[PDB]
C-alpha cells in the first residue's frame, strides 16, 4: 500500500555491479569480424557508459582448448612450454571494454584446461601448483601484454573445487605480486562451498566472494553465515525475446531481495555464435552476422540500463527493499553523496520465465504504489524518471520529472504488468542510439578463404567456429604453394568440460544449407595413422557436437577413405581404398544434392551417387580424425539454402 524508503536506520549490503559473460563457450566468436563501424557500435551498446547496457563487470572464459558450450576457445598454453598471450578474442574484448569504461571490473574463469595439465589424467587437481601456475600466467599475461588488471579469479566452472587448490592459487597469486586479485568460488551450487567456508578458517580467509549459478533468486543459510559477498556469478541464459528481458529484469531485483546477492552476471554478453548452436540467441543482444553487419539491440540491453546507468559498484542497497503487495518488486540504492536510485519491476509469470529454474505460477495485477522518503532522503524534491514496457513495446523512454516539492517526501505510481521504472536523482541517463544497421542476410552462398594473411589481427580465420580442437592461422615459410594455411593445433584431448568429440571439427556457414559443394586442400601430418575430413549438412555443435550428423568425407594416410553419416564414424555410406599418404597436399571435393553425394580426390571422382539421408541440412565443416596436427588451405563452399 505505502512502502517506506529510509536510511536513518542504516544501509543494506554494498552493490557490486551488473555484468555478463563472454565465453563458455565461443559466444563472442562472430563479433571479431564485424565491419566497422558496426563492431564498434555493438561494443558501445554493451560497454559505453550512459549509453546502452553500460555493464559494470565483464566476465570471460580462460580458454582451455576444450568445447565449452558453443565452441572451443584457445588456451594460452596449448602445450607444456608454450606461452602465447594473443590467441582468441577475450584479450581484445577486455581491451575494448576498458576503452569505453576504465572502471569496468574484469573477471576470469576456467571451463576446460589443456590436457597436458592432467599429467596423464583428465583432472586439473593432480598437480595443484601446475594448475595454479597455468591460471596465474594468464593473469600475468593480461597485465604484461594488454595492460589489463584482472579483478577476480574463479576455480572450475560448474565443476568440483579442491580446497587445497584454492589455497595454492592464493599463495601463488601472492607470490607473483597479485595480492590485489580476488578469488570467487566455486561457480557452481551454494554447496559444498558455503559449508566448506564455515568449517575451515584457512579456506574462509582466502575466498572473497561466493559466486553461485542459476540460484533462482535465493541463497542458503550457510552462505549468509559466512559474511562473504554473494553473487549470482552466472544467470539468465534465456532467449533475448521479451520473455528473456522480463526474466532478466525480475532477477536483477529479486536476486538481492530474496537471495541477498549483490551482483548478477548474465550468460552471455552478446549472441555472436550461430543460432542453431546450443542456447542460441541467449545474449543481452544479438550480433550473429559479421558478413552483413546486421545486429539486434534486443530488449535485455534496455532492461540492463534501468540498473546500470543509475548505479555503480560501491553504491549501497537500502535496508528498505521488498515485494509489492499485488506482485513484482522494488529495490533502492544510494551513493552516500545524496543520490538515490529506485528500480521497480512488475514482470508477470508468463513473460519472465528463465530457463533455470522454472517458477511456479505467481500473480501480478494493477496496483497503486505509494513511496515515502524518510531519513536523509526527505530532502529530495526532484526525480528523473525512466520507463520500459515489455511485449508492441516502449524501451527506456524518459518521462517527465516527478516533483515532491509539497514537502511530503512522497509520491504514487500507476503500476501495471510487465513494466519497469527507474526513479533517480542522477541526470546522466541516455538511450544511446546509432542508426539501424544493415538488414539480416543469410551466410553468403559462395564463400572462399585462402588464409593468406601474414599478420592476422586474430589467431583464427573468420566464421570458422571450432567445436572440438583448435584451428589457427599458420605460416610455413618452407613451402611456397602453401605458405599460409589453417592448422589444427591440439595434439591431445583437453581436460574436458563438455563431451568433446573424438575427432576435431570446425563448422561454418548457414545451418539451413541443404545442397552444397565443399572444397578444401588438406594435409595430414601424422604418418600411417593420420586422417582428415570435410563435411556438409553438419546439424549439431557445441555441447552436442558428439551428436552431429551429416555427410563426412574422410581420408587417411593408410590409403583409405570412408564416407560416414555421423562425426563419430559409426555409420558408413561408402568406404574404399585411395591413393592417399601423409605429408602430401590433396584437394578434397564433397558435393551433396538431395539424396546423393559424391567425393573427388584432386578433381577426379572417387565415389559418385552414394545415397545419403534426405532431407537433411546443416553447416559445412573441416576436421581431423583425432587430436592431431593437420592443415587446410584454399577453402571454398558453394551452397543452396
Ligand atoms: C536440393 O536438391 C534437391 C534434388 O535436386 C531438390 O529437390 C528437387 O526439386 C526439384 C525442383 O524444385 C524437383 O523437380 C521436379 O520437376 C518436375 C518437372 O517440372 C516436376 O514434375 C516434379 O514434381 C518435381 O518438381 C525434384 O523432384 C526434387 N527432388 C527431390 C528428391 O525432392 C531441392 O529443391 C534442392 N534444395 C534447394 C533448396 O536448393
Ligand atoms: C550525485 O552524483 C554525482 C556523481 O556521483 C555526485 O558527484 C558530482 O557530480 C558531478 C556531475 O557528475 C561531477 O561533475 C562532480 O565532479 C561530482 N563531485 C564529486 C565531488 O564527485 C554528486 O555530488 C551527487 N549529488 C547529487 C544528488 O547531485
Ligand atoms: C538477507 O535478506 C533477508 C530477507 O530476504 C534479510 O532479512 C536479511 O537481513 C538479509 N541477510 C543478510 C543481509 O545477511
Ligand atoms: C490474480 O489476482 C487478482 C486480484 O486479486 C484476481 O482478480 C485474479 O483473478 C487473479 N488471477 C489468478 C489466475 O489467480
Ligand atoms: O545455460 C547455459 C550455460 O550454463 C552454464 O552452466 C555454463 O556455465 C554456461 O557456459 C552455459 O552452458
Ligand atoms: Ca594459402
* Domain match, 250 and 137 both: yes
411, β-bridge pairs: 371
Pair (164, 199) in one structural domain: yes
Closest-CA residue to 48 (of 102, 108, 106)? 102
**Quick one: which ligand is closest to 356's CA?**
5
**Is there an atom of ligand 1 within 6 Å of 359 CB?**
no
How wide is the angle at C-alpha 138 spanned by C-alphas 101 and 152, nearest 5°?
50
Last residue of a domain, one of 385, 400, 427: 427
- Taking the C-alpha atoms of residue 641 and residue 639, their distance in angstroms, rounded to an integer, is 6
Of 21, 68, 237, 266, the residue with max ligand 5 atoms within 8 A of its CB, to mutate for a pocket test, comes to 237
399, 530: one domain: no
Ligand 1, residue 593: give the atom nearest the CA: 2
User: Where among 397, 427, 457 does a domain terminate?
Assistant: 427
Residue whose C-alpha cell is 593445433:
489
Do 315 and 335 form a contact (C-beta atoms < 8 A)?
yes
Is 315 marked within a binding site? no
Q: Which residues surround ligand 6, an ion (CB under 5 A)?
A: 450, 484, 633
Residue 237 beta carbon below 6 angstroms from any ligand 5 atom: yes
160 to 8, 125, 183: CA distances (angstroms): 43, 10, 15
Contact 253, 329 (CB under 8 A): yes
* Claim to verify: residue 482 and residue 410 sit in the same structural domain: no
Q: Three-class SS of residue 218?
A: coil
Instruction: Find the 136 Cα to ligand 5 centroid distance in Å.
Output: 24
Q: Which residue has the cell 604484461?
A: 144
Nearest CA among 495, 514, 522 for reference residue 638: 514
Provide DSSP, 535-584: EEEE---GGGGGG-EEEEEEEETTTEEEEEEETTS-SEEEEEE-S--SS-
* C-beta of residue 550 within 8 angstroms of C-beta of residue 541: no
State yes or no: is 234 an active-site residue. yes
Place of cell 568440460: 497
24 is written with which cell numbers?
563458455
Based on the fold, state whether residues 48 and 137 are members of the same structural domain. Answer: yes
Per annotation, catalytic residue among 234, 419, 460, 628: 234
CATH number, domain with residue 135: 3.20.20.80
CA dist., res. 255 & res. 167, Å (int) = 29
Q: Which residue has the cell 521497480?
A: 344
Q: How far is the CA of 90 from the centre of ligand 5 (A)?
A: 17
Distance CA 230, CA 217 (A): 11
Is residue 221 located within the same domain as residue 322?
no
Q: Are residues 289 and 250 in the same domain?
A: yes
Q: Are residues 257 and 386 in the same domain?
A: no
Q: And the C-alpha cell for 381?
A: 524534491
Look up cell 553504491; give the residue. Answer: 315
Ligand of minimum distance to the alpha carbon of 617:
1
* Domain span at 623: 446-640
Ligand 6 centroid from CA 72, angstroms = 24
- Ligand 2 pocket: which residues have CB below 6 Å? 335, 337-339, 425
Both 591 and 613 in one domain: the answer is yes
**Do both 117 and 265 map to the same domain?**
yes
On whether the CB atoms of residues 5 and 376 are closer than 8 A, the answer is: no
Residue 69 annotated in ligand binding = yes
Ligand nearest to the CA of 379: 2
Q: Which residue has the cell 524518459?
A: 398
> Dihedral sign, CA of 17, 22, 27, 32?
positive
* Alpha carbons 293 and 315: distance in angstroms, whole number: 37
Give CA–CA dist 122/208, Å, rounded.
28
Instruction: Judge if 276 and 131 occupy the same domain.
Output: yes
Which atom of ligand 3 is nearest to 260's Cα? 1
Q: Is the bond leading into 37 cis (omega within 30 degrees of zero)? A: yes
* Method by which the model was determined: X-ray
Check which CATH number belongs to the domain holding 369 and give it.
2.60.40.1180
**Structural domains of the chain, count:** 3
356 has binding-site annotation: yes
Q: Kindly state whether residues 436 and 313 are assigned to the same domain.
A: no
Amino acid at each position: 500500500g505505502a512502502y517506506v524508503l529510509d536510511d536513518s536506520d542504516g544501509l543494506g549490503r554494498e552493490f557490486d555491479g551488473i555484468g555478463a559473460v563472454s565465453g563458455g563457450g565461443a559466444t563472442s566468436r562472430l563479433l571479431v569480424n564485424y565491419p566497422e563501424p558496426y563492431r564498434s557500435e555493438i561494443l558501445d551498446y554493451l560497454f559505453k557508459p550512459n549509453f546502452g547496457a553500460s555493464l559494470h563487470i565483464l566476465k570471460v572464459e580462460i580458454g582451455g582448448d576444450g568445447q565449452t558450450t558453443d565452441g572451443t576457445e584457445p588456451s594460452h598454453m596449448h602445450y607444456e612450454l608454450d606461452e602465447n598471450y594473443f590467441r582468441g578474442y577475450e584479450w581484445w574484448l577486455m581491451k575494448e571494454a576498458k576503452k569505453r569504461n576504465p572502471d569496468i571490473i574484469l573477471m576470469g574463469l576456467p571451463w576446460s584446461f589443456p590436457g597436458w595439465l592432467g599429467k596423464g589424467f583428465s583432472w586439473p587437481y593432480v598437480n595443484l601448483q601446475l594448475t595454479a601456475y597455468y591460471v596465474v600466467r594468464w593473469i600475468l599475461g593480461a597485465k604484461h601484454y594488454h595492460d589489463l588488471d584482472i579483478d577476480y579469479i574463479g576455480i572450475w566452472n560448474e565443476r568440483p573445487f579442491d580446497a587445497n587448490y584454492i589455497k595454492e592459487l592464493r599463495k601463488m597469486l601472492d607470490y607473483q605480486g597479485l595480492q590485489r586479485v580476488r578469488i570467487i568460488a566455486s561457480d557452481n551450487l551454494w554447496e559444498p562451498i558455503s559449508s566448506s567456508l564455515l568449517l575451515d578458517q584457512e579456506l574462509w580467509k582466502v575466498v572473497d566472494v561466493i559466486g553461485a549459478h542459476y540460484p533462482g533468486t535465493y541463497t542458503v543459510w550457510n552462505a549468509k553465515m559466512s559474511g562473504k559477498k554473494l553473487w549470482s556469478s552466472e544467470d539468465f541464459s534465456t532467449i533475448n525475446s521479451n520473455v528473456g528481458a522480463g526474466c532478466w529484469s525480475r532477477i536483477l531485483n529479486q536476486n538481492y531481495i530474496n537471495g541477498n546477492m549483490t551482483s548478477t552476471i548474465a550468460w552471455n554478453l552478446v549472441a555472436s555464435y550461430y543460432e542453431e548452436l546450443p542456447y542460441g540467441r541467449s545474449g543481452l543482444m544479438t550480433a550473429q552476422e559479421p558478413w552483413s553487419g546486421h545486429y539486434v539491440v534486443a530488449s535485455p540491453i534496455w532492461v540492463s540500463a534501468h540498473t546500470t546507468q543509475f548505479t555503480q559498484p560501491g553504491w549501497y542497497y537500502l535496508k528498505t527493499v521488498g515485494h509489492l503487495e499485488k506482485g513484482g518488486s522494488y529495490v533502492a540504492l544510494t551513493d552516500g553523496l545524496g543520490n538515490l536510485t529506485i528500480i521497480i519491476e512488475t514482470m508477470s509469470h508468463q513473460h519472465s520465465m528463465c530457463i533455470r529454474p522454472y517458477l511456479p505460477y505467481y500473480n501480478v495485477s494493477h496496483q497503486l504504489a505509494t513511496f515515502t522518503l524518510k531519513g536523509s532522503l526527505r530532502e529530495i524534491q526532484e526525480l528523473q524518471v525512466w520507463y520500459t514496457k515489455l511485449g508492441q513495446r516502449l524501451h527506456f523512454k524518459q518521462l517527465d520529472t516527478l516533483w515532491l516539492l509539497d514537502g511530503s517526501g512522497s509520491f504514487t505510481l500507476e503500476l501495471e504488468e510487465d513494466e519497469i521504472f527507474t526513479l533517480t536523482t542522477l541526470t546522466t541517463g541516455r538511450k544511446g542510439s546509432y542508426p539501424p544497421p544493415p538488414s539480416s542476410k543469410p551466410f553468403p552462398t559462395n564463400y572462399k578463404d585462402d588464409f593468406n594473411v601474414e599478420y592476422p589481427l586474430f589467431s583464427e580465420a573468420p566464421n570458422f567456429a571450432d567445436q572440438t580442437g583448435v584451428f589457427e592461422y599458420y605460416m610455413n615459410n618452407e613451402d611456397r604453394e602453401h605458405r599460409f594455411t589453417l592448422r589444427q593445433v591440439l595434439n591431445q584431448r583437453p581436460i574436458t568440460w563438455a563431451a568433446d568429440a573424438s575427432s576435431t571439427i570446425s563448422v561454418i556457414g548457414d545451418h539451413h544449407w541443404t545442397n552444397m559443394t565443399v572444397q578444401c586442400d588438406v594435409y595430414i601430418e601424422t604418418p600411417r595413422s593420420g586422417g582428415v575430413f570435410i563435411a556438409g549438412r553438419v546439424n549439431k555443435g557445441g555441447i552436442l557436437i558428439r551428436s552431429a550428423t551429416g555427410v563426412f568425407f574422410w581420408i587417411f594416410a593408410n590409403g583409405s577413405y570412408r564416407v560416414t553419416a555421423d562425426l563419430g564414424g559409426w555409420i558408413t555410406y561408402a568406404s574404399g581404398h585411395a591413393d592417399v599418404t601423409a605429408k602430401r597436399w590433396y584437394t578434397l571435393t564433397l558435393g551433396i544434392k538431395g539424396y546423393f553425394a559424391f567425393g573427388m580426390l584432386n578433381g577426379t571422382i572417387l565415389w559418385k551417387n552414394v545415397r545419403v539421408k534426405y532431407p537433411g541440412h546443416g553447416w559445412a565443416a573441416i576436421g581431423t580424425h583425432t587430436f592431431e596436427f593437420a592443415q587446410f588451405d584454399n577453402f571454398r563452399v558453394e551452397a543452396a539454402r
